Subunit: 245 residues, 7 copies
């Protein structure tokens, strides 16, 4: 469930609803913790593939450099430690959507293979010469500017244009201030639902405190402040702290 | 299919037509996304070999450092990782055309080997002294200035001459604006036909917006702009953006 | 047992009691030797998991680069050296508390692995695809500015926010001086009980000497001074030394 | 066959004919595309050894660092990868001529080996102790200044003298312009004969265009311009291009 | 046997007597050859562990890496070369004292391991998951300055405080000139007993020569001078030479 | 055999005759192509060991750094590629003379082993433990100043004194012009006899041309010029080429 | 046989005589070609161990950096290439004297191993746990200022003192020019005896040449001149070449 109240955010929402009906690649941009991931999940559920699989892979969080292995999958003995066969992420997303979180940090080599997959609608596992027809909708996410990455030599131009037909950008939280109260309430309800507890309320004062803070860490940071506030138990007074904790 | 409308592109088309009749090596130049690939396909379809195989190998996209192994093919156990025999690209192009896409990414080592293939009209697979006679027409493309690439010592001179007997160059898309509107109509058409959507038209004011943009990314960028316009939806108007998305 | 006497430490204590009640990640900050480890054990014992296991891992003291192996455990064969299967730390801390001591020293590869565990509440050993459900409360300590570490690119930002919902910070000893005497007495006592020696007191002049020193090393340095003083012998007078009375 | 018309070339030719009659080492110099290769072939055919084998090895074109292996041959086992025995090029050249194309690319190690072969008129394969008696006339070419190479420490002086008893140098094409018209016709003829067609002719206007170009690529570049002209089609006219068009 | 005569040394000996009876870690400092080792042996004999083993391991004289191996011990096949099982130094020191000579030279890695042993009073061999309970008194010497080493990033702070509860420091020999005559006689004596010679005396004038020299190499240098004097020969008489001739 | 005509070379020759009679190590010095090699053979043939083997080894010409292995010999196993046993150059020179040509090129390590052999008069092959007794006279040449090379730390001092009891130095060819014409005729005759041709003479103006050149490559370069001359052809006139210039 | 004439050298000789009688470590210093190894043998023969073994090892002349292995000895398979057992130089010195020639070029690791052997009077071979009791008198030479190497960090201070209780230093040949005529004569005799030939005399003329030369390489250089002079056959007469000609 995605909270949208600010008029810039409704604009975003209506853009997203448009692409979500289609099978175009969606590039979801925005600063840290600004909600790129809930947007990607929103588009899947808004899309005609809603009932199909939703597979995510964070290319910025895959240790041991198993990014290529995770993506394409592999056969037993495709490399050191390949002790078994293993389907790629694309295989799991058949008939649904795949989310490439942070394609920016994918290496050039891997970008090449990914491009071919996008061009061919096919994929082979590492160690395999057998092709697999894909019916997969593609979403991607980036924290960097891909254009600048292309200009800087770290990203392929052709891969760029393919992934960026329809880019969606979250404004930073301080640019869409009307989202703050609705978001704050949501995060409170969220957390309290988890713990069987009834949701408390937030003092006007506390709300004001939340409104006049620029939120460098955006909605992630807000969520942090909200959870903190609940520990200083259930309400919302000046139980909000940002930078004097 | 290749659209041509601008009289610059017609002169180019005319040149391609001349050389396509022959068996000469064709080098196809031009900026990124200007149509080097679709040109090379036109030359094949125009040539006496149109019914033969068209094999493309993109040196600028061959991952895992496999350019050599892909080009020449390999026998089983020719290197660590070669679990099977695999014919090279020239073998596949037997009786038709091979396309060496972005040959400037080829290192001096492989350049030497290619030169020998072009000289002897023969190739051997890695791990084999079996000499395979070829009848393969050669096309190539480059995003780089091959001439200066030779002077910088990254490309062999003798190869450069074998490859540049008949160079064809695409103008950047903004140097040939009469191509823009028929290209947009073409891109829209093929996108819609692929998706199975009825194909709409572009409003005149939308056409104007497209003509007064320089297209840094050329036809590729135009394709991108046009697919974006379609999503914004069917019958383009001011659903064109390039720098002001917002 | 944790000695608290200065009003700063009392405010800190009351905050600890607040989070202990909950299952929230607690981050413990403060200079070297200021009590971060004992505060961790305090929170576990104040928590409803106090009857459960307390498991500690000093990420800054795991030699032979076994920090990953120690945390997650490993099947036999997982790496050259792994002669046996071995349970990870999260495993041992099932139903209780794990303490991540000096978590800032954990590299970015490991940090990502950890994030996964916090996000999923599941862990697999090195060399295994077997996911193990965790019911484990997390505490972490750092004597580095984790906010700065994120800015230096040495620390994942998302990991940071997950670990810093409720940061608790020990002031340096020199800015909670009402802690100094009770601590000195505490350290003396526990050292003497341990050694089976009678425990002596401290003379007022020695107390004044302790209060007027800045404790660069904090409570650890105080413990040092006390133990040295006891060697010089029983019933401390100015038998205190720091720099330079030696 | 070799086209000679300029008096500089004719002077070359007379010199070439003088050495051809002998068994002297011959060093063939001059810029790129100026005919060093076709001169070496001429000398061999003018020599008493013309019925004998003619063996070229281009040291600047042997991929994979197989230069040592190619020249001396090898036995199975000799080096990792050598799956079989292989005769060297000197062996093949028995009773005739060998052409060491671009000797300046040989490393000092190989140079020491070449020197011993020249001194002793025998050779061993890599991996073998059997010396094979040689009766082979040596020709060589360089694109680089070898006397300079010696002074820069990159070429052995003793080898330099053995190989340079009689150096022959091609003038650049621009400084023997009487060659250009006959070469161009020879090249048109060459291309046409290879394709069954009759030779076209060159309009006086086209000749003049050819004559007032400096040919930085020498005869190789001229060949290029000739073939391009033939694709542009069969009666040289304004079908000649150099650096403004194609 | 340790000779003490200067009031500074006597102060030092009294402090030594105070720590000897305790189990406290002792750190012994001082310039080179100033008697750090003999103080170690003195503290042991003065301790209630006197009849216990006295084990030394100088980390500044251990050939190869090893050190970790010789300190902790190893099982067979614990690393390339470990051909037999070997007891560690700590193991050997059971019930007595271990002397970690020049601890400054341990790398951070091994420091962490050492730190674990001190905290836990347990050691494992390289290769074993089996920990051995220790009852070992610890001594250390260093040539470097440890606090500066800690500030340099080369020595762990926690290990430092643990090892440095009671640092004992030898003044340079020139700062305690009353030790010189009895040391001179003691060294002669011990040298002559060992060689089975009568022990000579030192003439008053030779004593003056010894007192008015700075002793850059302290007692070691003195031993050197005194052995030299004896070669020059018996009852010493301005048979004393220092650095600067004969 | 050796051509000597100039006053300086006759004196050098006389010095050679004195050592040749002895067993002393001889160091032969001089610029590139000035005849150090032919001087070696001269000393061997003038020595009482003339009937014995003359084994040479050019340390500046042995490919694949198999210098040490070639010197001392090796047993099957000593290193990889040592699929057989092989006698040393010292072993082959038993009863005769060994020539260490371009000895300035041995790495310091090889110098050490070389010193031991000269010290003890014994040699062991690589991978062996048996010392082989030696009766071998030693000759050495260098392009470098070994004195200089010692001060640069590239050449052992003790080895230097052992090899330089009696150094003989060829002056450059331009410093001994009376050698030029006898050499040129000797080089022609040698070349023509080998190829089975009549041997031509050199016209006086060709001699003159040859004398007024500084010969930076010395006798090697002379040999070169003279072989070029015979190709341009018979009875040498000014078919003499030197630099650029560039005739026929 | 040593041959000493200059009064500087007779002082040297008297000091030598004094250490020889003892078992003290002797450090022999002096410029290259001074006679350090001549003196080391003189010390052995003057000592009570004169009937025992005299084992020399040149640390600056051990190829294939086999110095450690040569010193301590080794068992089969102690290190690749060690196809057999081999006693150290200390072992074969048992009951006599070892000479460590050029001990400055021993590395720090080996120095530590050397210190241990001198402290414990024991050695064990490479690849062996068994320690061999030693009764070996130690001599050593150095071309370098060891004190300075200690200051430069290349030589252990503790080893330096153990080895330098009694340094003997040769003056350069030019500082003790009375040695020059007797040494020259001794060397002519030497060389003539090895060849089985009558020894000739040197013209005073020639001797004067010998005394007015600074002998940069000392007695070894003088040797070269004398041998050279004799090739310019037998009767030194200004068959003397140095750096005049
Ligand atoms: N519009 C929204 N409605 C509801 N929850 C939201 C919204 N935006 C953000 N959140 C929540 O706030 C946090 C934002 O994190 P996230 O969706 O991961 O943003 P992000 O841009 O992907 N961060 P990252 O990729 O690490 O730079 C998550 O806990 C979301 O559940
Ligand atoms: N004249 C044309 N007619 C039709 N489609 C065209 C034309 N020119 C370019 N395109 C399309 O534009 C896109 C760009 O790819 P391509 O045309 O082959 O350019 P390119 O020069 O090879 N790009 P690159 O090699 O990556 O620098 C493709 O989708 C082509 O189909
Ligand atoms: N409030 C306290 N009550 C009792 N003991 C304390 C207290 N504070 C510190 N100590 C003791 O003094 C020493 C301080 O150590 P510790 O708790 O490890 O601090 P730390 O912050 O974790 N040091 P570090 O190693 O830099 O991470 C230990 O012996 C503690 O047991
Ligand atoms: N005199 C000539 N007569 C006929 N063809 C010639 C002549 N000179 C050059 N050519 C042709 O020009 C081209 C280049 O000649 P080539 O013998 O390769 O010169 P090159 O100096 O060896 N080139 P390179 O080795 O790369 O520096 C070939 O096609 C030759 O056939
Ligand atoms: N007080 C003392 N009484 C008797 N002998 C002493 C005394 N001090 C030093 N020595 C002797 O002097 C020498 C050097 O002493 P030592 O204990 O080795 O000093 P050190 O400081 O530990 N050397 P180092 O660690 O290398 O700087 C040894 O021979 C000792 O036995
Ligand atoms: N005096 C001479 N008599 C006869 N032939 C000579 C004479 N001097 C030189 N030569 C010949 O001219 C050439 C000179 O070469 P060489 O004798 O090898 O001199 P080198 O000093 O050893 N050259 P290098 O080792 O390269 O510095 C050889 O071909 C010799 O045979
Ligand atoms: N006093 C001497 N009496 C007799 N022979 C001497 C004397 N001094 C030197 N020699 C001889 O002259 C040479 C000097 O060499 P040596 O005795 O090895 O001195 P060295 O200082 O050890 N040279 P090195 O080890 O290479 O630095 C040898 O040939 C000695 O035999
Ligand atoms: Mg993300
Ligand atoms: Mg391309
Ligand atoms: Mg800690
Ligand atoms: Mg060539
Ligand atoms: Mg010590
Ligand atoms: Mg030579
Ligand atoms: Mg020596």
């Amino acid at each position: 469930h995605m909270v949208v109240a600010d008029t810039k955010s409704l604009k975003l929402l209506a853009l997203a609803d448009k692409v979500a009906k289609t099978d175009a690649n969606v590039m979801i941009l925005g600063p840290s913790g600004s909600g790129k991931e809930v947007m990607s999940r929103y588009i899947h559920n808004a899309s005609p593939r809603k009932e199909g699989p939703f597979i995510a892979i964070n290319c910025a969080a895959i240790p041991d450099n198993m990014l290529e292995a995770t993506l394409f999958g592999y056969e037993k003995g495709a490399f050191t430690g390949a002790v078994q066969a293993c389907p790629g992420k694309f295989e799991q997303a058949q008939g649904g959507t795949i989310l490439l979180d942070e394609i920016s940090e994918m290496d050039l080599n891997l970008q090449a293979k990914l491009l071919r997959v996008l061009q061919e609608r096919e994929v082979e596992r590492l160690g395999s010469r057998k092709s697999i027809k894909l019916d997969v909708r593609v979403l991607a996410t980036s924290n960097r500017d891909l254009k600048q990455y292309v200009q800087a030599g770290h990203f392929r131009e052709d891969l760029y244009y393919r992934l960026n037909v329809f880019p969606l950008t979250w404004p930073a939280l301080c640019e869409r201030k009307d989202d703050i109260e609705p978001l704050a309430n949501h995060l409170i309800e969220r957390h309290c639902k988890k713990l069987g507890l009834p949701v408390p309320s937030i003092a006007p004062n506390a709300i004001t405190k939340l409104l006049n803070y620029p939120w460098p860490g955006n909605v992630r940071e807000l969520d942090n402040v909200v959870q903190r506030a609940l520990i200083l138990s259930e309400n919302g007074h000046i139980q909000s702290e940002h930078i004097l904790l």
